[PDB]
Amino acid sequence: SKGEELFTGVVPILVELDGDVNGHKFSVSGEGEGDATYGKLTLKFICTTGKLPVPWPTLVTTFVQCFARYPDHMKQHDFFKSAMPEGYVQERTIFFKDDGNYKTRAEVKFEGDTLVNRIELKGIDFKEDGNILGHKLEYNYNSHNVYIMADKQKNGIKVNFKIRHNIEDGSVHLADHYQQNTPIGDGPVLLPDNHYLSTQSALSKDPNEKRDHMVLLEFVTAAGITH
Amino acid sequence: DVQLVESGGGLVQAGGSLRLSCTVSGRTFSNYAMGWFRQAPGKEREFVAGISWTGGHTLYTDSVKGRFTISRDNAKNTVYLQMNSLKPEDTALYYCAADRAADFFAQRDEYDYWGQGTQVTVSGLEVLF
Ligand SMILES: [K+]
Ligand code: NA
């Protein structure tokens, strides 16, 4: 309500990630803006520690579902905006089939007039010549459905979805996502009926930018309840 | 809480096809894992097919594998059971069932809610040539 009101216009975003995969440490900073009226996010990420040791598409999901567009009839099911400005904790395990896994913990909250996603990522059991550390992912992204259920026992939501990563040999590498979101503030909140976020992502580059980087555009609309 | 109404049943010849529907009224359809069961007179209800709330995970009893398809339309409160290559042994009263989903999977049992059923009759008549 008051939380939803914070998203009526364009909101600045900052993202910060500290990461360690198979011992390779790295850091990413991002900035951009979100317009939840349209379900639209635009971000730019720079690896501030040099070369990113994993492919950029593997971090798209880690890099703010409060910017989803919830249609009018579904607005009572938007956990993410209600929890603002105090925010929520998002945790994932991401299993790359026949490879290693990411574990992430993020806090998503407002710092001033800015929505901030601060993340820590640890990745283990990857193959040094597999698709991830070997950089065999196409620089692109497909559409997915993010399935959300209430987790009443934990005052939050649990989320599951499977990302399809296109590989340079024409194959597809599946990344199973297991996600939980818990409010940062205390007190029981209203939790949604089962629904999903229709998510579309487009990755691009700034051709003058010489640092290792990703430009990410996202379009996210909630769906899956009767109209 | 929720009410289930099956339809699409009837008589068809062995090798024919039928599409059953189950319409869910009341609470939010996407909250429920959905299933189809079937019963021959005097025998028990046996599980036929089950679908997760998301539609992304399905289960089937062996004897219908590759002939029946369960699917759902979460914006239309309906689950369907496409039954192809029907055999006389498929003749039965077909029940729709529902259960508040605990996770993202389908389930074979422990359904709380039940429809009254729609009759499916598969004739075994052989032409005399
Ligand atoms: K695809
Ligand atoms: Na039950």
DSSP state of A192: P
Q: How many CB atoms lie within 10 A of CB A46?
A: 16
Residue B15, min C-alpha distance to chain A (Å): 35
Chain B environment of A146 (Cβ under 8 Å)? none
Query: Which of B30, B54, B104 lies closest to A225 in CB terms?
Result: B30
* Domain limits for position A48: 2-223
Q: What ligand is nearest to the CA atom of residue A143?
A: 1
CA torsion through residues B58, B63, B66, B67, sign: negative
- The C-alpha atoms of residue B106 and residue A146 are separated, in whole angstroms, by 17
Residue of chain A whose Cα is closest to the Cα of B30: A194
Domain CATH code at residue A79: 2.40.155.10
Q: How remote is the CA of residue A174 from the centroid of ligand 1, in Å?
A: 11
β-partners of residue A26 are A19
d(CA A141, CA A58): 10
Residue A35 to residue A209: CA distance in whole angstroms: 25
Chain B residues close to A149, C-beta within 8 Å: 53, 101, 103-104
The domain in which residue B41 lies consists of 3-123
Closest listed ligand to the CA of A141: 1
Distance CA A42, CA A33 (A): 6
Tell which phi-psi region holds residue A22, choosing left (phi > 0), alpha (psi between -120 and 50) or beta: left
- Domains held by chain A: number: 1
Residue B114 domain-assigned (yes or no): yes
Q: B110 alpha carbon to ligand 2 midpoint, in Å?
A: 4
Kindly report the CATH number assigned to the domain that includes residue B101.
2.60.40.10
Give burial (CB, 10 Å; 0-12/13-18/19+) of B116: exposed
Chain A closest CA to B75's CA: distance in Å? Answer: 4
Strand A114-124, strand A10-21: pairing: parallel
Backbone conformation region of residue A112, classed left if phi is above 0, alpha if psi is from -120 to 50, else beta: left
Residue B128 lies in a domain: no
Residue at A175: amino acid letter: A
Is B129 contained in some domain?
A: no
Residue A194: Cβ within 10 Å count: 23
**Beta bridge mates, B18:** B83
The H or E element that residue A79 is part of is helix A79-82
How many independent structural domains does chain B possess?
1
| Of the partner residues B30, B75, B76, the one whose CB lies closest to the CB of residue A194 | B30
DSSP assignment letter at B109: S
DSSP codes of every residue in A117-178:
EEEEEEEES--TTSTTTTT-B-S----EEEEEEEEGGGTEEEEEEEEEEEBTTS-EEEEEEE
Q: Which residue of B has its CA nearest to A192?
A: B31
Calculate the dihedral angle through the C-alpha atoms of A65, A66, A72, A76, rounding to the nearest 10 degrees. Answer: 100
Which chain A residues in 173-192 lie under 8 Å from chain B, judged by CB atoms?
A: none
Residues of chain B positioned with their CB less than 8 A from the CB of A225: 28, 30, 74-75
DSSP label at residue A57: G
CA pair distance A163, A157, nearest whole angstrom: 19
The residue type of A19 is G
What's the gap in Å between B56 CA and the centre of ligand 1?
Answer: 15
CB B117 within 8 A of CB B94: yes
Resolution, given in Å to one decimal, reads 1.9
Does B10 reside within a domain?
Answer: yes
